[PDB]
Amino acid sequence: LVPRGSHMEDFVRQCFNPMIVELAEKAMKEYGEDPKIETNKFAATCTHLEVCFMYSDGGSKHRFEIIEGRDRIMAWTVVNSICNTTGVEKPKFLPDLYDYKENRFIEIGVTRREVHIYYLEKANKIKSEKTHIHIFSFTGEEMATKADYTLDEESRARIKTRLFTIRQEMASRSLWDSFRQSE
Ligand SMILES: COc1cc(CCNC(=O)c2nc(-c3ccccc3C)[nH]c(=O)c2O)ccc1O
Ligand SMILES: [Mn+2]
Ligand SMILES: [Mn+2]
């Protein structure tokens, strides 16, 4: 029932850096998913992963603590350390980053719908008011809590450009339509 490859899989392996592909594979397998069949979720996990890493690449050297990309047990271990060090409330859901400069966790979101729908979706799940939310879209829009976009405009514009490039590469392969209507 598991195939030897699809068009979305070969594109993902060609589109994203190999370390991004390996971490997304480990993330889905940890949660009982196979990138070879769940190929749309495979591309989304890679995209969310690259956005998280470009995000932390913005700002100072020691500004961010990367939560995404670690295994669930170690990600929660770093979260407990951050909460037990700074005093920030432990979030109910595992976030993506921690901002040592702003003293808050960040939940990064990447949507194929309107940024308005996803942000409201993540906000109603986040509860913990302290967790900052920052949503990106494949169209170039972005939403952040309190209109506080954390990073510089150049770092965010770089992320938006990459998202639209991934969109164009998918569409030229006739893979974008099935990718959008699958979120
Ligand atoms: C149960 O689903 C998974 C959960 C994990 C744990 C860590 N991932 C997140 O916490 C996370 N997931 C997503 C996400 C959700 C659905 C489709 C694609 C995406 C990209 N969007 C985020 O913003 C985020 O932070 C790993 C793989 C999964 O398949
Ligand atoms: Mn996450
Ligand atoms: Mn996220």
Residue whose structure tokens are 């047990």: 73
35 exposure class (CB count in 10 Å sphere: 0-12, 13-18, 19+): buried
Q: Which long-range contacts (CB under 8 A, 24 or more apart) does 122-130 make?
A: 125/93, 126/91, 126/93, 127/91, 127/92, 128/89, 128/90, 128/91, 128/92, 130/88, 130/89, 130/91, 130/104, 130/105
Which amino acid would we find at residue 136?
Answer: F
Residue whose structure tokens are 């954390």: 150
Burial 50-82 (b: 16+ CB within 10 A, else e): bbbbbbbebbeeebbbebbbbeeeebeeebeeb
Nearest-CA residue for atom 14 of ligand 1:
45
Is the CB of 39 within 6 Å of ligand 1? no
CA atoms within 13 A on the CB side of 87: 0
In this structure, which ligand is nearest to the CA of 48? 1
48 is in an annotated binding site: yes
Q: Which of 122, 127, 146, 160 is catalytic?
A: 122
Tell me the sheet residues that pair with 104.
99
**Rounded to an integer, what distance in angstroms lies between the CA atom of residue 76 and that of residue 149?**
25
Is the CB of 93 within 6 Å of ligand 1? no
Cite the beta strand spans of the chain per DSSP E.
Answer: 64-66, 97-99, 104-111, 132-137, 142-144
Resolution of this entry in Å? 2.3
Is the CB of 75 within 6 Å of ligand 1? no
- Distance of CA 129 to CAs 67, 92, 107, 123, 146, Å? 18, 11, 12, 9, 11
**Rounded to an integer, what distance in angstroms lies between the CA atom of residue 136 and that of residue 117?**
12
Nearest-CA residue for atom 6 of ligand 1:
27
Is the CB of 141 within 6 Å of ligand 1? no
Nearest-CA residue for atom 19 of ligand 1:
45
- The method recorded for this entry reads X-ray
Distance 96 CA to ligand 1 centre (A): 10
Residue 106 near residue 95 (C-beta atoms within 8 A): yes
Distance of CA 178 to the CA centre of its chain: 20
Distance 96 CA to ligand 2 centre (A): 5
Order of all β-strands in the sheet with 142-144: 64-66, 97-99, 104-111, 132-137, 142-144
- Distance of CA 115 to CAs 100, 141, 151, Å? 26, 7, 18
Residue 17 near residue 166 (C-beta atoms within 8 A): no
- Give the dihedral sign, CA 17/21/27/31: positive
- Look up residue 165 and give its DSSP letter: H
Q: How does DSSP assign 25-60, residue by residue?
A: HHHHHHTT--TTT-HHHHHHHHHHHHHHHHHHHSS-
20 is in an annotated binding site: no
Domain ranges of the chain: 1-183
**Rounded to an integer, what distance in angstroms lies between the CA atom of residue 92 and that of residue 126?**
7
